Amino acid sequence: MHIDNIENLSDREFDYIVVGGGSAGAAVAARLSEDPAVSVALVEAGPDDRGVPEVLQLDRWMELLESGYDWDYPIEPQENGNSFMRHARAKVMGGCSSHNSCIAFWAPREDLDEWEAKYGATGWNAEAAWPLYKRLETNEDAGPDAPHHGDSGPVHLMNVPPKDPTGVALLDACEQAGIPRAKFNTGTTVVNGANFFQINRRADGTRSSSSVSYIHPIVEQENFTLLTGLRARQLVFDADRRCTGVDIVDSAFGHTHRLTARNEVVLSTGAIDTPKLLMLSGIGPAAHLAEHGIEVLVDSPGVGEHLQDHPEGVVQFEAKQPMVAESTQWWEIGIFTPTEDGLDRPDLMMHYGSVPFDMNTLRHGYPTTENGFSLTPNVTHARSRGTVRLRSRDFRDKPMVDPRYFTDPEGHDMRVMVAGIRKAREIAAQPAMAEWTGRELSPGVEAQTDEELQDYIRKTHNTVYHPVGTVRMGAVEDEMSPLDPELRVKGVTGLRVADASVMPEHVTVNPNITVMMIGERCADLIRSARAG
Ligand SMILES: *Cc1cc2c(cc1C)nc1c(=O)[nH]c(=O)nc-1n2C[C@H](O)[C@H](O)[C@H](O)COP(=O)(O)OP(=O)(O)OC[C@H]1O[C@@H](n2cnc3c(N)ncnc32)[C@H](O)[C@@H]1O
């Protein structure tokens, strides 16, 4: 059952409590609940999404940013980036799989195999992931000549039909620039290729969010309790350092209530909120906790460290003809291309949007339009590393999020981004786009030198909205990895984390489907542990 008033819940004890109903957390709770002998609670600070058309209808997703469904995290001042940038994060069942543009990718096998081979995370490789991406999806390309794909899973993946004539022309321009059309999600990584995306959307226009796909079917299930509108303020531990449950706060008076777990708590509040909850709960860098008056239960110095993202630039053009008035999600094409030789994954990706994107350019005086399109280059393995830290001991205060954009010492991220703006220009200038590409509105053709393009990037960049890696998994003996390879929080028992916080290195592509696969894997790890 769904409980949106804690006063109506009499028994506050469960076998498992999953905190955060987002991409991973919805997957973990649904899968755990498939054993009818265990009880599962899923606790989510935002509201239920059932019946909320602006969340459910994918083509409305742009309206959600900065609304009441967005926690809206500003960043710390940036040494070499855009201090006005905001990390939008959904506050609603489904988490960010409920606010995003549903671009759906399997991660490159080369990214996943490196989690075990290079970063110490035993058992995390493409062998472990592939059957889980298969189990979670119902893909339109499934069939016996593509046996890796799922045809039965709860998350529906479909091909964006090629209806936007500007997008067809842009892919024709990609081909003229030496970037062929490529099929996505075949299991073979695309290093140089472009196409319309696969999106996790249902045939009726509803986003196949983790809440739509995993939770809506099971709300009334006997052993399942969904609690919305309830915000966790700390995890609690007995004198054995065993996690016994979570303290949550209601929206009426801000009273604190305890939910208790007999077996395990899984924390899935995402890459910004998870490290903050662990630190509030005494698990984090000792001197940082002591400076906020928090008693250190585990000195765990990698909590909040290693923050990674896909930083993003934009090139905006005025369109020479009326742009499409309807769309699946307004950002229907992706282009991958390598900026140097010898790579087995592309270092550069770009999105094509059939809209302008002036959120960061208008304040610096760049001209804008109501009829244009955008190309957004992003660095796929940015080398910069940032932090999520407590702003105070009060759980109500937003944390300090400092991605340290464009600070890596070799200057890789700024180099790939400058190459990305040039590449976007070269694509838009091909003869197949000649009836569409009008004047370049940002940065504008006056910006030509590396220095002019770097200044533009520093002032106007955004994010593809993909923060990961702040509570990473790694080797049992690696003290900078807060989790072991079974996603258990080191130094306590009964506590795992499953969300985008766990990645030891960013993936090449948009990460949502991989985060759901992390939730699927966490459920399998728990169910195996329960058997013993
Ligand atoms: C924001 C965003 C993300 C995004 C995107 C567009 C935007 C605007 N476009 C994407 C796309 O088209 N394709 C893609 O592959 N990824 C895209 N992204 C990112 C992807 O959505 C995110 O990386 C992914 O969803 C993260 O999943 P994860 O499970 O790590 O985190 P979450 O969905 O944010 O879920 C966390 C939940 O926890 C709740 N919460 C947070 N704090 C609390 C407390 N204290 N108590 C209880 N609940 C809490 C959140 O409300 C959220 O529901």
Side-chain angles (χ1 to χ4, degrees), residues 322-464:
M323 286 301 288
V324 274
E326 314 211 306
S327 182
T328 51
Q329 33 69 291
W330 311 97
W331 291 85
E332 297 193 313
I333 279 166
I335 302 168
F336 290 105
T337 201
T339 70
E340 66 178 309
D341 282 315
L343 301 176
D344 64 7
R345 286 155 276 179
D347 57 347
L348 169 69
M349 178 187 179
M350 60 180 86
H351 297 70
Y352 153 74
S354 56
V355 288
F357 184 67
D358 62 22
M359 171 189 280
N360 291 300
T361 56
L362 187 73
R363 67 175 65 91
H364 295 290
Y366 292 92
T368 193
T369 183
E370 296 180 357
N371 185 64
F373 60 90
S374 299
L375 290 173
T376 51
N378 74 69
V379 183
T380 64
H381 297 267
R383 292 184 193 172
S384 299
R385 290 295 186 272
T387 59
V388 172
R389 298 203 118 212
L390 292 184
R391 179 178 310 280
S392 76
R393 69 190 81 193
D394 182 338
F395 75 103
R396 291 165 304 178
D397 291 330
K398 292 185 180 183
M400 296 184 70
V401 179
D402 182 6
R404 311 197 47 212
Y405 291 115
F406 305 110
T407 56
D408 72 284
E410 298 154 308
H412 167 88
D413 292 1
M414 175 75 75
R415 178 195 78 60
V416 172
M417 187 72 75
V418 166
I421 296 178
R422 304 198 192 274
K423 178 61 62 163
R425 286 175 161 173
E426 171 186 24
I427 296 166
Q430 300 293 321
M433 277 288 286
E435 296 307 342
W436 291 100
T437 308
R439 175 192 171 220
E440 183 189 296
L441 295 166
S442 77
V445 294
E446 302 75 11
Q448 286 307 326
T449 67
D450 275 14
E451 175 192 276
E452 291 163 336
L453 285 183
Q454 289 163 0
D455 292 351
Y456 171 71
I457 291 167
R458 178 189 306 110
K459 275 168 17 175
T460 66
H461 79 87
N462 202 45
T463 170
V464 202

Side-chain angles (χ1 to χ4, degrees), residues 20 22-24 44-45 71 90 95-96 99-101 103 232 269 465 500 510-512:
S23 298
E44 167 52 47
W71 292 95
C96 295
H99 86 168
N100 69 11
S101 40
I103 293 165
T269 44
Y465 299 105
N510 317 57
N512 184 224

Side-chain angles (χ1 to χ4, degrees), residues 91-134:
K91 180 178 181 185
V92 66
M93 279 298 299
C96 295
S97 78
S98 284
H99 86 168
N100 69 11
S101 40
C102 285
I103 293 165
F105 272 106
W106 286 41
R109 59 185 68 247
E110 301 88 355
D111 284 323
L112 302 185
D113 283 340
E114 279 175 351
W115 289 15
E116 168 172 64
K118 178 162 181 146
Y119 304 112
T122 308
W124 288 80
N125 52 37
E127 273 194 20
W130 253 229
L132 299 184
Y133 281 135
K134 182 178 162 71

